[PDB]
Every structure is written in C-alpha cells, then in structure tokens.
TrEMBL record, chain G:
Subunit structure, interactors included: Core subunit of respiratory chain NADH dehydrogenase (Complex I) which is composed of 45 different subunits. Interacts with TMEM186. Interacts with TMEM242.
GO BP terms, alphabetized: mitochondrial electron transport, NADH to ubiquinone
Keyword Mitochondrion: yes
Leading EC class: translocase
Xref: Gene3D superfamilies: NADH:ubiquinone/plastoquinone oxidoreductase, chain 3
Main location: mitochondrion
Keywords: Electron transport, Membrane, Mitochondrion, Mitochondrion inner membrane, NAD, Oxidoreductase, Respiratory chain, Translocase, Transmembrane, Transmembrane helix, Transport, Ubiquinone
Record gene name: ND3
EC number(s) given by UniProt: 7.1.1.2
GO function term, MF aspect, one: oxidoreductase activity
Sequence intervals crossing the membrane: 40-60, 72-89
Family per record: Belongs to the complex I subunit 3 family.
Protein name: NADH-ubiquinone oxidoreductase chain 3
Amino acid sequence: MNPIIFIIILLTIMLGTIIVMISSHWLLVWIGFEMNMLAIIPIMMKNHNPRATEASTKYFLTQSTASMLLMMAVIINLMFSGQWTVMKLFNPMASMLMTMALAMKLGMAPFHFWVPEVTQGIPLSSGLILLTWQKLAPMSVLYQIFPSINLNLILTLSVLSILIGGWGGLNQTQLRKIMAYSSIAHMGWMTAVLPYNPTMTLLNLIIYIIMTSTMFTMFMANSTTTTLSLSHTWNKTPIMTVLILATLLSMGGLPPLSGFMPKWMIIQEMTKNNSIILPTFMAITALLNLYFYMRLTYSTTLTMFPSTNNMKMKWQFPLMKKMTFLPTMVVLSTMMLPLTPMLSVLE
Amino acid sequence: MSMVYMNIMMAFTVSLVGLLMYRSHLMSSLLCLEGMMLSLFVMAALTILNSHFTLASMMPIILLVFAACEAALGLSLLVMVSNTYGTDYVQNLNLLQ
Amino acid sequence: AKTVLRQYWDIPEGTECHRKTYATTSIGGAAGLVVSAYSVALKTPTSFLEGVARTGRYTFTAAAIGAIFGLTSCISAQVREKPDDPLNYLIGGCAGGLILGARTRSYGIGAAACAYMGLTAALVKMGQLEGWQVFAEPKV
Amino acid sequence: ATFQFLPDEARSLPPPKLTDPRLAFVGFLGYCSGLIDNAIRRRPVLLAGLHRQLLYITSFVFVGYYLLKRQDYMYAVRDHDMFSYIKSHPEDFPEKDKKTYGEVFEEFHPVR
Amino acid sequence: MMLYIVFILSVIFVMGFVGFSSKPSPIYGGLGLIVSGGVGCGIVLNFGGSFLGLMVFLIYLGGMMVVFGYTTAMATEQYPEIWLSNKAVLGAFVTGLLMEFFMVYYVLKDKEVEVVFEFNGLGDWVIYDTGDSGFFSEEAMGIAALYSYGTWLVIVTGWSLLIGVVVIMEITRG
Amino acid sequence: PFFDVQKRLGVDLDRWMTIQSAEQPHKIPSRCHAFEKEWIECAHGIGSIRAEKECKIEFEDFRECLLRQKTMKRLHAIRRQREKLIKEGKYTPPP
Amino acid sequence: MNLMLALLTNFTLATLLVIIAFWLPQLNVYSARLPFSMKFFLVAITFLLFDLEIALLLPLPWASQTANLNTMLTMALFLIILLAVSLAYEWTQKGLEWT
Amino acid sequence: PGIVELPSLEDLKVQEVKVSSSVLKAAAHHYGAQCDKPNKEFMLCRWEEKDPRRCLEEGKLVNQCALEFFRQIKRHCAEPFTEYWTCIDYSGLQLFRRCRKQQAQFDECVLDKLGWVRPDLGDLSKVTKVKTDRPLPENPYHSRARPEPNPEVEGDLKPARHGSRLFFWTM
Ligand SMILES: CCCCCCCCCCCCCCCCCC(=O)OC[C@H](COP(=O)(O)OCCN)OC(=O)CCCCCCCCCCCCCCCCC
Ligand SMILES: CCCCCCCCCCCCO[C@@H]1O[C@H](CO)[C@@H](O[C@H]2O[C@H](CO)[C@@H](O)[C@H](O)[C@H]2O)[C@H](O)[C@H]1O
Ligand SMILES: CCCCCCCCCCCCO[C@@H]1O[C@H](CO)[C@@H](O[C@H]2O[C@H](CO)[C@@H](O)[C@H](O)[C@H]2O)[C@H](O)[C@H]1O
Ligand SMILES: CCCCCCCCCCCCO[C@@H]1O[C@H](CO)[C@@H](O[C@H]2O[C@H](CO)[C@@H](O)[C@H](O)[C@H]2O)[C@H](O)[C@H]1O
Ligand SMILES: N=C(N)NC(=N)NCCc1ccc(I)c(Cl)c1
C-alpha cells in the first residue's frame, strides 16, 4: 500500500467509528458501520495470501450479515414509533435483532467463531485494530440502547462469552488466537455490567484497549506470532520479557495491577444490585484466562527456553520498530490501581 | 399489521435462512445477502411512503447506494477467492481452523 | 422454558411425584435437544442416520438425568416429610450424576458428576428458599 | 453541559493543589515511562535523554492535572445531586428517632 | 381482484425469494432475484413511489444485478446445473412454497391470519391516505431535499463511494 | 449520541430527519404529525422512565395512527357482521 | 392498467414470435474461473460505483427548485468533483489500461 | 373512548358549484379577486380549528359567493366566457398561454360590464389578513395537561464530602 493511501484508509476507519458515536439518527449509525467495514477490509488483505483472503471473506460475511440485521431492527423500530432517533427501541423484536446484530459485530459468543480465525489470518497490526478500535462503535450503541435490551439475553451472551473465551484459550499456541479468545472473554465482562452501570462498561473497555494494545505492540516489536517464537525474547530483549510478564498478570486481573480495577469495579456494581451468584461465577471462570496467561509467562519470562545458534547474529542489531506509545501504554497497563477513583471522569 | 408486511417480513426471513444455510457457491450467499437488502428497501419504502414522511424519502436510496457498494466489495473478495482455488466454493476457505 | 419451569415450581414438594418427573424430564429432554442441535451443526454426522443416532443418544441421556432427579428428589421429600430441605435435591442431583457415569461407563465421571450435580441442585433449592437472583433485575 | 470536559460551573470548586499526592503519583508514572523508554531502546536508563525524560514527567503531570479536576468535579456533582434529591423528597428520608443502648434490646450470645 | 394487487405482488415476491434462497445454481438464483426485484418495484410503485420504484430497475436490476451476473459468468458458473436436480434445493423450494401457500390460503379466507404476529387481510388499500391534491410529488420533494437538508448525508455518502473505488483497487491488485 | 458534538457545536448533522414532525419541504405534513407532536411535547424533558407511564395515552394514540391496528379491527368487525347478515337476508345496502 | 396492458402485449407478442420461430413444418421424415482478465471485472465494478453516484445525481433537476441554492449548488458540484477524483485515481493507478 | 360527533346529513346540504375544472380554471383569476373575503375567512377557520366540522357555516358562505360570482358572469359575459373556457378545456394541460386571445375578450367584457380587474402576477399568492369575530381557538389540539418537570436543581457546588468515598481512598 502507498503510504498516503494507507493513512486515508485508516482515517476512513476512524471516521466510520466517529460517525457512529456522534449520530443521533439510526441511518447515520448504519452508514458509520458500513463505512468502517469498507475501509477495514484492505488492511486485512494487505499481505495478499490465501489466509488473508479467507479472513477478509469470513469477516465480510459476518459483518455484512450483522449490518443487515441492524437495518432490519431500525426499520421495525420505524414502523412502531415513526422516528429514527438513536436511543431505546420501541419494539421488543427490534431490540433482540439489534442486540444480536451488535453481539455479532463484537464477536461475543455464540457468534464468536470468526474472531479467532480472522485475527489469526491477518497481520499483527491489523489484529490490533480489529480487537481494539473496532469494539468502540458497537459498544457505543449498546451504551445508548441498553434500557430496552432484554436482561436475560444480554447476561446469557455475557456468561457464554466468559466461558467460551476462557475455555478456548487453553488449547492455543498461536499468539493471535490467544488474544482473540482473551477478547471474547473480556467482552463478556463489559456487557454483564452494562444493564447495571454503563460507566463500568466504559471503564472495562478503556482498560482492555490499553492492555490489548500493549500486548500487540510488544508482539510486533519482536515479530512474534507463536508461543515458541516469543520464548526466544529472553535471549534478545530481556526487558521485553519483564514488560510482557507484568502486562499478562494485569490482564489476569491480579492485584495490585491495573487489570484488577475493571473486574473489581464490576463486582461492586452487581453486588449493589443484589447479584451475587453471577459475579462469583464470572470471577471464578476468569481463572481460566489467568491460567493461559500464566503459561505464557512461564515460557517467556520465568524460564529460559532453548535458543538457536543464529540468534547470536541478532545480538548485533538494534530494535528499529516504532513501538509507538509502548512506554506509556505499559505503565498504564500495570500501575493505575492507585488512581482507580478517576473512573468518575467517565460518568 | 397490513397484509404486505406479512410477506415482506417473510421474504427477509427466507433470505436470512438462505444466507445462514450455506451450500457451496459463495456467490449463492452473496445473492441471499442482496435479497435481504431488497426486502429491507421495499419494507422501508412502504413504511415511509404510507406515512407521508417526506424527508425520509431519500433513505431507501441511501440504503441502496451503500448496500451496492457493499455488494461490490463482496464480489471483489469472491473473485480473489476464485483466483486462488479456481472456484468460489466455501469449503476451500478452511485454512484458518 | 419459563412456562415449563413455572409448572415445576408451581407444584409443592413431595406431592404429585409423577407430575414433577414429567416436568424435570421435559426440562432435561429439551436440553439434550439443544446440545444435539449444536453438535450436528458444528460436527457434521457421517450420515443422516448417524446424526439421528447421536441426537437420540444425547437426548435420552439428558432426559434420563432430569427424570431421575425429579423422581429421586420428590420421593426423598415424600419419605422424609421435609418439603423445604436442600438435602432432598442433593440426593436428586447425585442420582442424576450417577446416571451420567453409567451412560458414559466411567465410575470416575459418575463420582465427579454426583458431587457437582448434587451441590448444584442443593444450591438451587437454597436460592429458591431465600430468593437468590441469578439474573438480578437492576435496582440501583 | 453536553460533551464538555469541564463545564463552567466546575470553576466554583477549589483547584487541585500542584502538590497533590495523586498528581505526584502521576508524575512518578511519567518518570517510569521515561525509564522504560530508555530500556526498550537499550539506552543508559538513568542518564539518556534528560530532555525526553523531562517531557515524560511534564506530559503526565499536565494531563493528570486536568483529569484530577474533572474527577473532583464529577464527585462534587454526585454529592450535589444526592443532597438535592434528599431535600426534595423528605418523606423517603425521614429523620428516625434514635434510641440508646440502655433502651434497645440485643440478644446475648455467650462464648463458652 | 385488482384491489389486492399489492398483496398479490407480495405473494410473488416471497416465491421469488424461495426461488433463490433455496440456492440453485447462481445463474438461476440470480434470475430469481431479478424477478423479485421487478416485483419489488411493482409493490413500491403502487404505494406512490414512482421514483423509488424506478431506482430498483435502474440501480438494483440494471446496475448491481448486472454486475452479479457478469461476475457469475467469469468466476462462478458458465453452465448451470439442471434446475431442481438437487434434493436439498427442491426440498427447500417445496418447503417454502407450501409454507407460503398456507399463509395465503388462511389470510384470504379469514381476511386476517396469525403467523407468529397478527396480520390483517382486509386489503392494503384500507390504510391509504384519503385526501391529496398538492401540485407536486411529495416523494420527489423529499428526495430533492437531499441537496438542501442532507449536506451531511451527501458528504459521507460521497466519501464512501470514493473509498469504494480506492479499496476495490487495493483488494484486486494482489 | 454517545458524543453530542452536534449540540455542543450547534451544527445539525442528522437531527433534521429524526422525526416526522420536523420541518419538511414545502410544509408537507406527515399523516401522524399531530399525534407525534403531542407525544413529543408530553414526554419532553422528563425522561423515558417517567414518559413510559405518564405519556402512555399520547403514545397509544400515536401508535394507533401509525399502524391503525384498532381501526382495522373495528372495520373487520363491521365487515364480518354485514356479509353475515346479508346471508340471512336481514340487511340491504343502500343505493 | 394501461401500462400493464402495454407491457403484457409487448412481451406476450415477443413470446409468440419466438415460439413460432422455433416451430414450423420441416417436411422431414428422417463452474470455474474463465480465462478472462481481471480488467473486465474491474470495468464492471467501476461501472457499478459510478452508476451509484449517478443515482445520487438524478434528483438534481428537482433540487434546483430549492430556495437553498447556495447549499444545493455546493453539494451538487461536490458530488461531481469526487466522481471526477475517483476517475483520476483509477486513471493514475493504471486502472483504465488494457496492456 | 367516546363517539365521534358528526353533523346531520341535512346539516351538510348546500347548492354545489356544478361546473367543470376548465370553467373554474378560466374564472379563477377573477374569482380569486372577487370572492377573497369569504374565501380567506373560511381558510382562516380551517387552519385555526383544524376541524372540518367547525367551519361548515363558513364553507357554505364560500359556495354562495361562488354561485353569485358565476350568476354574474352568466348575466353579462356569458358568450365571451364560454369561448374562453372552451379553449382552456381543449388543452390536455388546460394551459393559459394557448388562449390569450379569448382571455382578452373575456377580460375586457368583465371590466366594461362589471368593473372587474384581473389580479396581477403575484397578487393571489399574497398572505393577507382577515377580520373574524370567531374567537381564537384555545386548545385546538385537545391536548391534556403536560407532565410536571422534574425538580430543578439549584445551589452552590461544594467539594464532595470526603472525596470519592470509594472504599479506602481518602481523596
Ligand atoms: C506503584 C503502583 C503500581 C503497583 C503495581 C506494580 C507495578 C510494577 C510493574 C511495572 C511494570 C513492569 C516494569 C518493570 C520494569 C522491569 C525493568 C527491570 O527491572 O530490569 C529488567 C531487566 C533488565 O534487562 P536489560 O536491561 O535488557 O539488560 C540487563 C543488563 N543490565 O531484565 C532482565 O534482566 C530479565 C530478568 C529475568 C526476568 C526476571 C523476572 C522476574 C522479575 C520480574 C519483576 C517485575 C514483575 C512485575 C509484576 C509486579 C511486581 C509487584
Ligand atoms: C457449583 C455451583 C453451580 C452454580 C449454582 C448456582 C445456584 C443458583 C440458584 C438459582 C436461583 C435460585 O432458584 C430460583 O429462585 C427463585 C426465587 O427467587 C425461584 O422463583 C420462582 O419460585 C416460586 C416458587 O413458588 C415460583 O412460584 C415462581 O415461578 C418464582 O418465584 C425459582 O423457581 C428458582 O429456580
Ligand atoms: C527531567 C527529570 C529527570 C530526573 C533524573 C534524575 C536522575 C538523573 C541521573 C542522571 C545521571 C545518571 O548517570 C549514570 O548513573 C549510574 C548510577 O548512578 C552510573 O552507572 C552505574 O553502573 C553500576 C550500577 O548499574 C555501578 O557501578 C554504579 O552505580 C554506576 O557506575 C553511570 O555511570 C552514570 O552515567
Ligand atoms: C470525509 C469528509 C468529512 C468532512 C466533514 C465536514 C463537516 C460538514 C458539516 C455539514 C453540516 C453543516 O451544518 C449544517 O449545514 C446545513 C446546510 O448548510 C444547514 O441546513 C440548512 O438547510 C436546510 C434548509 O432548511 C435545513 O437543513 C436547515 O433548515 C438549514 O439550516 C444546517 O443548519 C447546518 O447545521
Ligand atoms: N446506571 C448506574 N447504575 N450507574 C450510574 N452511572 N449511576 C449514576 C449515579 C452516579 C454515580 C457516580 C457519579 I460521580 C454520579 Cl455524577 C452519578
């Protein structure tokens, strides 16, 4: 890709998301999703191989199907209220379709099958956009229509995502599939608290984006896409193993790291609503995620895996990738718990 | 509701089921995707026309334009898939299992 | 599914045993169908008759588990004369747990299922008695 | 207001002190980012690029200062809303008559 | 009766959808969609949507569906399999028609049917607007308003179409 | 909107098409203009929780204008009673 | 009715002429990828996208009646320029070539 | 819900203006100039009451003024007028520009015999003012009382008491 075209396509991705977040009209929300999808396909295809073509095709079909269901919900809403305003919907059938459409876009279980495959089939930089920026638009709609959302449906989607995301990650050695199942589990926490306190959805979303961006950036810095490739980092960039260790433990929700804060604040909100079984089940199930984060820390940081002779050649050359914002992101990924009350800025 | 809404809603469902029950040709699924859009256009036009909601008259056109541009992207991916395996069968798109 | 659970919970405890088993079997039998549906969809059976055999296999097991749980749980309350006691479903839950071990021909799985199903069933009675919410309505 | 970071009413509140302990922590986080920047690029961690390290601290403090202001404004708004609601609905928040422990009866549970 | 033309068209509309949704060869699936598109225009025409109806012919049928058929000739099929020669397509085709017929038979007899949701059967003419004598097409006034009210709609639509050109060239370069 | 840029900048990007009682070309009214107008004014500024109960009457009327489900049900009732009576020869339509 | 009668007559007559063409006394007693360029696919897609922009331009004769002429003309020219820009992009990117 | 009041069938009887559209088209410009007062009183009533049942009396005065208008053409200008609207009637679009010769003859006849002046371009589209003794409608939409607004909040914004109060935090 021409560097100027790449920038223009990236801005179109951003503009599609922004349109969704500033629109008060359902048609413009739908247009935002269409624009966003149109511009995201070229960055998935940018390395021109059969796996990239398969990923883009599977992505296109899933997102296109969801956008059709979103439009169907919009028209049903128009039939029963005679208006297009982006807010609660005025028909239960429209609410179910819109909720399922957005769950499909987010990749929540049991509409989750595309996320591991699409992420595996596209470059790390494209996966970073897919699993972070692309969550903003569907979540911003869910933030506005949640009063009309069926509580049983949304909590069922949340519980299944935490279970599927946790179990799916245990069997993975590919770093992009691990991140994909991590994403599915984390969307579950975001939507579980949505009916009770949407502010905690935003808090979990922002913190998730920061840690996920950190992990993808560190994977890109070393061009690692597999567990065994990542296990060579100790014999090249020892510092990077420590950063990876801390970030993974944060993503595991261990105190006193930043990734504890969203799980902690979400448990608080549901208990205030006399919801005890659900937070307890979710916290225990999230130990599945902690297990396969810990496995990565074992092979990356806490043990020294075997190396290769040709690695000595790498010792002589500096790390020249941009690694943009990594020092900032990694510090926020790990050391923000003392500043937790700052979550009220999102209110 | 009116009679027509029964059949128009049914047509959307039929094409949705058709889309979710894949066969072999990827083209056949793109047709079901475009059938869903057709019924959406007809359903919205009928609602907007009957209610005399004048400024919404442009909405079905905007839907048609974006959907067709969206269908163009789908056809581009189909030809790239077909250039790789010689057919558009969806059972060839299983490398990422 | 709300309606099926309603008639089960509508009836008292240790009364109309044949009605409880019908309800529990119906609940369990449906779950076997849902499990069967995804199984054949995501794991294509070798032949049409092979898929029917798999569907019957799963559905029979799920129906059997629910049937025994309701039968065993409602008799226990009847014999012990303790309608509102979690231990009744603890017996009902383990009974259904053992059936799974039999259907899977694994004494280890039966013991594991006995405990997990037994504790789960007991917790369901405590929640019913004390109004535990799983999907709590937002209040604050 | 709508889509305003710090509405005009927030100027009635006292500003955060430049010696705020939270602001010092934010400054510390900025310093840590400066060191990790040197480490990933294999520079001398403590000495390298003092100009860069100065901007890391300054950037974090500057952004941290305004986030602290919004944080304090949002909690003040929360308290302001809550007291107004209590004032406007005295029937839901009655001043109950408190009794003394000599009057109230509490069961004794011996530990023996 | 002619008073039920819209209902009659909507019945054919559904059959066309069953035609290509059962997914025969995409050559015939495309034909089923062309017929549905033409019938879809007919429905829209009878609700006063002259301009919107003709856009279906011009854009949906004369544009998008031509490219669909064009691409099918290149990348999908050149010869079609005998229509209904596959058991699955015929089964789906027969399944849809019978479901459609049972829906139509009951609504006509009762002037109302309950397929999941409640539907009337008196006729679509009953919901129509009664008084009209403006000296213009209201449907045309709304679409023309795109250039005076919908500045925002034009910009984002215009941008997206330009991006479509850029993106498709990137996708197909290889 | 999630970010209300339109209100904050005072720019109308899409609010003009959101409702059918807004300004229209050549003052063409929608069929349910008065019903939507009444329901919007009742529900303005009190929030959807309050509006769902206190403006229920306006919304019910507005929904009747939109879909005419009650009106069709009443006509379908008179049509049933006529083409029945006509069979028992007890009614004769006027010229 | 008149238009439907016209359409029925035109295509019914076409059907009759086609069948009598196929029938007459003869007095006798005894799915893959075409080897076809990607360029031709790109012509079809390019036509489609331009055809969509022509759809947006068709209302222009009615839009010229508005009192908001300043806005109408600016958006009308904006749409055509962007259509020209996409043509320029294809041209410079060798998209209108056949070699 | 109540019963929709409707006026009796004999409360709606009136002498209708039983002439074709090309006759009205030919007479429209003089008609608009001559019958403006009852016409605008009726249109004021319709847009104010929003109820056709409430303007039936003024609607009747519209017919009377129109019948009197045409009885006055029939009494002085019958033959020039018949030539004119017969030329209008011939056109499929009933165009004025095809009949300027016959229009002038009719225009001259009414001016000479009735002092009628044809309104100039732009006149009949003017917004005019009408004097009416009909009281201004109070609740034309028949709207209920509006819900009371939520208790508005007014006061001095003080710092949050003891900060966020989140678990253990002191600020
Ligand atoms: C304050 C409030 C917040 C509280 C939460 C806790 C915040 C702390 C987490 C901050 C984020 C992680 C950043 C940690 C900085 C690590 C830098 C370091 O200590 O040195 C790394 C070391 C140097 O390697 P290098 O520079 O490449 O070459 C050495 C030649 N002299 O690299 C090596 O030599 C590799 C050594 C082998 C790996 C040993 C792994 C065990 C040690 C891990 C310690 C970090 C664990 C972080 C978890 C939190 C701890 C509480
Ligand atoms: C290893 C642990 C595994 C997870 C264990 C999870 C335990 C979860 C407990 C489930 C919730 C408690 O169980 C549920 O409680 C509510 C009461 O609030 C009951 O609610 C019902 O009870 C009454 C009984 O008269 C019925 O009339 C009525 O239908 C309804 O009120 C449900 O019938 C019961 O199923
Ligand atoms: C903008 C705000 C920035 C605030 C920065 C405040 C601290 C800045 C310190 C700058 C000077 C650091 O200078 C650097 O320090 C370390 C230890 O101190 C020295 O290097 C060290 O190596 C080893 C320890 O690793 C020891 O032998 C000994 O401690 C020392 O020799 C370097 O020889 C010196 O170059
Ligand atoms: C990819 C490119 C992205 C570039 C984004 C640039 C943003 C463009 C902003 C367009 C909207 C400008 O702001 C908006 O313009 C239109 C026309 O001028 C105005 O609209 C005007 O035309 C009609 C006439 O009645 C009505 O909509 C309205 O009565 C009138 O104000 C809006 O009052 C104004 O709010
Ligand atoms: N929907 C929810 N339960 N949560 C929620 N956002 N409640 C609103 C209550 C609240 C809480 C903190 C602050 I600071 C402010 Cl100003 C207001």
